[PDB]
Amino acid sequence: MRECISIHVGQAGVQIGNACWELYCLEHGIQPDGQMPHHHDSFNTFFSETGAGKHVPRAVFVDLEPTVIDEVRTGTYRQLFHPEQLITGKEDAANNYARGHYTIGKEIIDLVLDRIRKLADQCTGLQGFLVFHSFGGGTGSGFTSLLMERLSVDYGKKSKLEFSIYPAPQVSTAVVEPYNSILTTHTTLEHSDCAFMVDNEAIYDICRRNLDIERPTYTNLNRLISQIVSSITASLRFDGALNVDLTNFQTNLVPYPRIHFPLATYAPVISAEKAYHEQLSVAEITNACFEPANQMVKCDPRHGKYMACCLLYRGDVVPKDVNAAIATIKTKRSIQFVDWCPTGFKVGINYQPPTVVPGGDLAKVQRAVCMLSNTTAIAEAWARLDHKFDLMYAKRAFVHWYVGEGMEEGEFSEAREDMAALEKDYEEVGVDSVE
Amino acid sequence: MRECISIHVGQAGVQIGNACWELYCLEHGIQPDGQMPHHHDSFNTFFSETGAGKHVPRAVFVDLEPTVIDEVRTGTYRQLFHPEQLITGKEDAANNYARGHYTIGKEIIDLVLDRIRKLADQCTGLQGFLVFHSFGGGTGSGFTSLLMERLSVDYGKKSKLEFSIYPAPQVSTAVVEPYNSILTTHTTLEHSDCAFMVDNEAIYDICRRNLDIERPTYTNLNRLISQIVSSITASLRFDGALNVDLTNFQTNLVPYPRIHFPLATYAPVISAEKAYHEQLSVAEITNACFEPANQMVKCDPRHGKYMACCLLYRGDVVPKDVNAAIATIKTKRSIQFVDWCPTGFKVGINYQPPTVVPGGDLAKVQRAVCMLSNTTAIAEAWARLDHKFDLMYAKRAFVHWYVGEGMEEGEFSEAREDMAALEKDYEEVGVDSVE
Amino acid sequence: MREIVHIQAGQCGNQIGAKFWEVISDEHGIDPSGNYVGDSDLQLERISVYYNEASSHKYVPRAILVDLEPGTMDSVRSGAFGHLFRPDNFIFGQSGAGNNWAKGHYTEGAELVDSVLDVVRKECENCDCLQGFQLTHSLGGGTGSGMGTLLISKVREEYPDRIMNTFSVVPSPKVSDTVVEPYNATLSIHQLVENTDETYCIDNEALYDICFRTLKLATPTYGDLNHLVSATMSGVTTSLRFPGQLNADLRKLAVNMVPFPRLHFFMPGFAPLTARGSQQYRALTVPELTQQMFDAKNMMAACDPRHGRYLTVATVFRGRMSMKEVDEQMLAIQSKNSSYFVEWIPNNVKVAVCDIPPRGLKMSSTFIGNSTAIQELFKRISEQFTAMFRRKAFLHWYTGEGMDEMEFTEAESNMNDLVSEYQQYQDAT
Amino acid sequence: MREIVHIQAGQCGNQIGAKFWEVISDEHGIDPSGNYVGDSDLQLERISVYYNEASSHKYVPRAILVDLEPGTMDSVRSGAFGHLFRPDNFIFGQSGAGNNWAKGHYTEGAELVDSVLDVVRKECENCDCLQGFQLTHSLGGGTGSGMGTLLISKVREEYPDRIMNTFSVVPSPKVSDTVVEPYNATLSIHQLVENTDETYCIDNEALYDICFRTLKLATPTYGDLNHLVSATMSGVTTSLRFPGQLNADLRKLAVNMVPFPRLHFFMPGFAPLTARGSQQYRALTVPELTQQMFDAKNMMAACDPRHGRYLTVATVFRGRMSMKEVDEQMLAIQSKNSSYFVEWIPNNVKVAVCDIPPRGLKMSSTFIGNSTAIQELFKRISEQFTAMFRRKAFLHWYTGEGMDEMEFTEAESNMNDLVSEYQQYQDAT
Ligand SMILES: Nc1nc2c(ncn2[C@@H]2O[C@H](COP(=O)(O)OP(=O)(O)OP(=O)(O)O)[C@@H](O)[C@H]2O)c(=O)[nH]1
Ligand SMILES: Nc1nc2c(ncn2[C@@H]2O[C@H](COP(=O)(O)OP(=O)(O)OP(=O)(O)O)[C@@H](O)[C@H]2O)c(=O)[nH]1
Ligand SMILES: Nc1nc2c(ncn2[C@@H]2O[C@H](COP(=O)(O)OP(=O)(O)OP(=O)(O)O)[C@@H](O)[C@H]2O)c(=O)[nH]1
Ligand SMILES: Nc1nc2c(ncn2[C@@H]2O[C@H](COP(=O)(O)OP(=O)(O)OP(=O)(O)O)[C@@H](O)[C@H]2O)c(=O)[nH]1
Ligand SMILES: [Mg+2]
Ligand SMILES: [Mg+2]
Ligand SMILES: [Mg+2]
Ligand SMILES: [Mg+2]
């Protein structure tokens, strides 16, 4: 009845979406082929119903290179997806935002926009867009920019939520990573309501310590991020003692036109053998979620101040003990809020306990907490990325590639100055000021 | 009771008619041999019953060369057709309009007319004529123009509908199409109630893109044509909640005596494996039929105005959503009507779902939409074709074949200015005028 | 006694009448075979008004069904509930009029009209005292609009001292079923306002809004849309078919509702309209029935009464009810809504009570109000006809069957004169 | 007789209403199917104050449930006690206001209040003599707060000579459920101050403390919280729902407790509250009832009357008792606790007695006090709002849907003026 559509861009987007839609299929009790053996609406939010008993997702898979889309076609989820949406080009952007935004990006953007319009007109009470894309990827960044511009032009005032993949400080897999990051962030700073950040090194630390897995393939990381996505969406997808919506998320998290860069966290993340020797109480999971060693962005909030917080509890939950835990964490010393935000908390509750996938790394739980914090600890990450980009650009490396692929110098200069101003404003707002 | 006869001329008409009459027996449950395994009339308007249980069609197959008719006699549909009607000459016209209209047309025109009066007297409530003739060829252009003179005088005011094969702009089978087309249109402009336009290059895109077939032989292409043909007369042969007769479209789609050139369109056209993942609702097939990528003539309607429209639904259709879906089309701005046509739609419903021939490309479907819009977008088709012919006549290429076979040079000038007059009037009426 | 003859022209008439003669059988307890199998004797004391008794206690309807094309009869003749009609009545032509006025009034309809007048004169040479004729035609098509107008002028000559009521279906403002509506509509009204006594204007999406919103139906087919026009049709003629505390009849409505000869275009309306699930939660009583009548949501003509003033109002109640509630509330309606009533007709309300409830319901009522909100209905049609005729669109197919541009001069002028007097009476003082 | 209409807004409104109608059905002996199954006739002697009679002896609540988000309606319709409400009452929008005053008062407000006002006018038709309105809502959310404000303004416009009681769930002082409370709270408070009659401010953490300490519940839930609130509301309304030795009603309470137009913010309380185990070790009697009423620990609003003075006090008793003990002991209360009573209102006392006890208990009592301890709540809200607004945070989307800065300035000025008047009237001589 309130319809939200998901756009998955790049190889990271496609894999994360595969994991996320798998998790949705287990959550709503639907078989991979579309049949099925509080519950029934819920699936009408995502799974559009066809003439027969089959249900089909509202997903729009788009890529330039065809290999990953061929893989997802050949995967076990071959019947579920509607074959038309799997849009593939012929060659990738090869970590070139110029290629992914100007040269080839305009030859397929018309088709993806046509499919978006078809799906959005198909639904009734459209809510918004969820964009699953990376930052290092050239196609990811270019299509992110292009699709943000096109969707903002077409649909005026709707929710546009992004689940990015922040570049890691020490872990690195690209060389034009600072260029891609600066360009995409400058382009999509003004065209997104609220953009979450996820980093791979942080997830690797979490999986190494909290879950104690020595062989953490990308499947486990994708499973984790899918769990956060499902937790944030379960409020719309299910009924609870206190519901919360995407507009609620925006209006309670982001206070300013530019400062809309929160970070996600999930709890509890404990292993299988350690499940038996733990109690899993509301207060203890709340403390674990607020623990700085569980955050999924490699930035310790001890260097900064929390500015806004939203927590969704799901499962059997009592609002009294939720209140007690929130009050004691508010009165704790190490967590420090801003002076001009006397109330910095937003609580939501859901009656549906999370369900664990078969063969997954996590264990079955009766209570789950998802946390989304808008803080100032992201300023250090912005500063580090800006410093890396400036150091790389000081002697004009790869600029010949970028300029040859239809660029100029004003774009780089304006992106640099724009992120300098954004970091300055972020720090000035986050820091305490007299009066 | 109300009877219409079909005249199929040339290998275009015969090949279309081979699959055209393939569909009617399937619709009325007629075995190829005439035996049988809404109902009970159905077939009395097409299948003139004989003494035995056999039903024979009301078709007049005529051609100059004895080639294309030969496989009809030796095909699987051998017993169904009555052996007398298959009129054949001895040699073709060789894409020569002069040969098929002055030299060899006359020596056989008196034989087809004999079988017309034979069949017109056999029926009681004769309604009109169906013509299946192309434009590029000789026997399909010059010979059928002779018929339009012969049937008009014999029967003053009856229905005369033509299902032409418009020559394609880029695709070009023959080399003298600009000579055959302009000579045909000028003579048959004043002897046609309405002429549905079909282009050959347009059906490739429909089969390649919408249906996703890489090997579109003429067997599969002609299948997509008989569906509209069986759609125009789908209300005479079956009872519906809102019936339409052949004079309805003739009255609803002809604002002026000259502007009577509509263009067909069919929907839904979807593949077999894609059928399971489509909802196939009344609300979308109205939009699916109207999209500019689904028309069967290579002329995008966005360049012009919709002079009028006409829709014929069927199956489990409810007249409310038809009212609802049609109403919202006026709001959407890909449609653009003329000022003097505030009401510009016609709707017809039927209770018989369409039936798919076994082995065909289409899949079983419960609904069908067949739009016939007279629109200004066809004005570019005449002007573009008129440019090609005007280039030929500049240096009188290929003329010596025409002049020596029984036509004058002066006759060519009259056909040239006639298309200029039609183009001027059609654009002037289509464009707005003061007061 | 007080006989009536019912005519059906066009596709709608044969479709509306397909369900009209269904409810009448249920009211009078008549089996589809045609033999009475009822129990109460109050039905048969006046059964001859609509049904006609024949040999061996078999009753056949006093109605004639006609169309230029044969598709419509084959549905009703071969289908169920076609056993009770007398086969002589089923007049059908050769080909349909093809949504053309001229082909239905001059060229093709002229042949068949002689085959139907000789049935009408035969129709009740046995009818003891004719009350009048009921005509159920459409204003959009050719056969229903064209010949149905021709039939009226011919019937008017043979029976001048009689009344006829037309249950026409006036075209919709938002949607046009056929492209050339304004030509058929204006050409038909020009002859209607001359030789008819009273007209029930009805829209189609006005029934769509009522069925979707009030009745809560998602897929209203024509089987359900026409089923509500039948209820209004049975309500008007239930006064002289059943005993009542305060009786009325067709001649009583005409004199109470037509202050001037050129003003006889009405607006029907029915109440109550409750769903199959939301009816146990509402107690049926006289209060809400009158309230449900006067709101713009529940009216069968798509015209907002708020922009106009009622000239006269007639309500035909049914069921069993004390009269005090029936009239004590029409004062409150007159008092609360005093701004929506014309001033120079004090006491502009007509009421009537029957004594037989509609099947399956405890009580119900019908509203027929001659308002001035029809003013906006004729302006819109005359507006569309104004622009279309200026370019002579579709005109070259009317002049070819007898008519001419001279004919169109009167239709627009007479309409323009009529719609003006339909308004300056509202503004008169 | 003295009909009263119930309005519910927001998720809090729907949940509190579900529990409240649970209480009313249990009190009046109404089966979940909707048919009376009780034995006593005193309850049916006056059944029409809340319920409405319908055919087949059904009873339908006079409830108007409406919220922008449809989840609450889906839950209440699918769950039990959904078989007695009338579906037409259930109004729901497309999307929740998202804790935004702008979206709850300007964007969906127009259409939603149009529909709900039409339903209100329909509902008030059946009432014989309208007594007043009840509106249970929250000042924290967006839809409930803003739309209840708009609905209250329009209902006041339509019905000037009538009273409305608002049960507002004031945001808790110690904890905030959401982030942006103060803007919504200040705007709603100013609107209520301008256009309301009386307000029973109810807090959440105070009720948490009451349920944990006095009732000894380890894991209290919203079910128990709403149980207590519904008990308070039923105790308030039983005075005119039921007979008694000394009856009172809504207008009596309002005239006794609104000495000035801008001072109508109250503080409720209920007694007794005893656990299932510790109920057999105390004899239920008027002394412990009154003493438990008059101790801050048993106060349903998070304020301590020790810092203020009881401006006026109402005690609505239940069960069977004697006015002798009632009065002589509330007199003992007045004598012992004199220092916390205002001096310029001698006899600041109102007492009423009913006859029907609450279900499953010998006798109970409800306290309603107008004090000056709400001043601390108002000033704390003012401090939070002024800080968050001088930072100008979250402001430009309240601006982005209609508002701008001078509205916030004027709301703060009006609320501060009310605070100043409240204090200077507490400290008068
Ligand atoms: N979280 C997560 N991130 C991934 C995964 N796979 C790849 N990535 C990230 O994606 C980045 C690669 O960019 P892509 O968008 O995949 O680029 P591409 O798909 O090869 O297409 P081009 O950009 O044109 O080369 C790497 O830096 C990774 O950090 C994954 O499975 N999980
Ligand atoms: N749609 C369709 N068009 C066809 C088919 N076969 C031939 N044509 C068209 O027919 C044209 C050839 O002209 P024809 O009128 O058929 O020539 P003919 O019938 O052999 O007669 P002659 O000109 O005397 O040889 C080509 O340009 C094709 O576009 C067919 O199977 N389907
Ligand atoms: N209310 C209602 N109207 C109908 C129904 N069926 C058809 N109509 C109306 O009838 C009109 C069709 O005109 P008709 O006079 O019936 O046309 P026809 O009888 O098929 O014959 P032609 O006039 O020659 O086309 C349409 O505009 C519809 O609005 C129905 O079931 N219910
Ligand atoms: N006493 C009580 N208060 C409740 C209960 N449930 C929610 N609340 C309060 O209601 C507030 C939520 O505001 P609502 O108006 O209901 O918000 P909503 O219904 O989700 O819709 P929006 O206003 O648009 O956000 C919270 O601050 C809670 O304090 C309940 O069961 N009992
Ligand atoms: Mg790639
Ligand atoms: Mg040939
Ligand atoms: Mg017809
Ligand atoms: Mg809500």
Numbering used by the authors:
A (entry chain A), B (entry chain C): 1 to 37, 40 to 42, 47 to 441
C (entry chain D), D (entry chain B): 1 to 429
What's the publication's text?
Microtubules are tubular filaments composed of αβ-tubulin heterodimers, which adopt a pseudo-helical geometry. Microtubules switch stochastically between periods of growth and shrinkage, a property called dynamic instability, which is critical for their function. Microtubules are stabilized at their growing ends by the so-called “GTP cap”, a region enriched in GTP-tubulin as a result of delayed nucleotide hydrolysis after GTP-tubulin addition to microtubule ends. The structure of the microtubule lattice in the GTP-cap region differs from the one of the GDP-microtubule, allowing members of the end binding (EB) protein family to selectively recognize the GTP cap, binding there with about ten times higher affinity than to the GDP-tubulin-containing microtubule shaft.
Moreover, we could demonstrate that polymerizing ‘mosaic microtubules’ consisting of a mixture of two mutants, αE254Q, and αE254N-tubulin at an optimized ratio, can eliminate mutation-specific biochemical effects, thus generating a faithful mimic of the GTP cap. At 20% αE254Q- and 80% αE254N-tubulin (referred to as 20%Q + N-tubulin), mosaic microtubules grew steadily with the speed of recombinant WT microtubules which grew at ~21 nm/s. To test whether the different tubulin mutants incorporate in the mosaic microtubules at the same 20:80 ratio as present in solution, we conducted mass spectrometry experiments and found that 20%Q + N-microtubules indeed consisted of 18.9 ± 4.3% of αE254Q-tubulin and the rest being αE254N-tubulin. First, using TIRF microscopy, we performed titration experiments of 20%Q + N-microtubules to measure how much mGFP-EB3 bound to 20%Q + N-microtubules. mGFP-EB3 revealed high affinity with a dissociation constant of 14.0 ± 2.6 nM, similar to that observed for pure αE254Q-microtubules. At an optimized 1:4 ratio of αE254Q and αE254N-tubulin, mosaic microtubules nucleated and grew as straight, 13-protofilament microtubules like WT microtubules, but were stable and bound EBs with high affinity due to the presence of GTP-tubulin throughout the microtubule lattice. Thus, we conclude that the 20%Q + N mosaic microtubule is a faithful GTP cap mimic, isolating the structural and biochemical consequences of the homogeneous presence of GTP in the E-site of tubulin dimers, eliminating any detectable other mutation-specific effects. The lattice parameters of 20%Q + N mosaic microtubules predict that the GTP cap displays an expanded lattice with hardly any supertwist, very similar to compact wild-type GDP microtubules. Hence, this finding suggests that the net structural change induced by GTP hydrolysis in mammalian microtubules is mainly an axial compaction of tubulin. Hence, considering that 20%Q + N-microtubules are faithful mimics of the GTP-cap, our results indicate that the microtubule GTP cap exhibits an expanded lattice, which provides structural stability to the lattice while the protofilament twist does not change much after GTP hydrolysis.
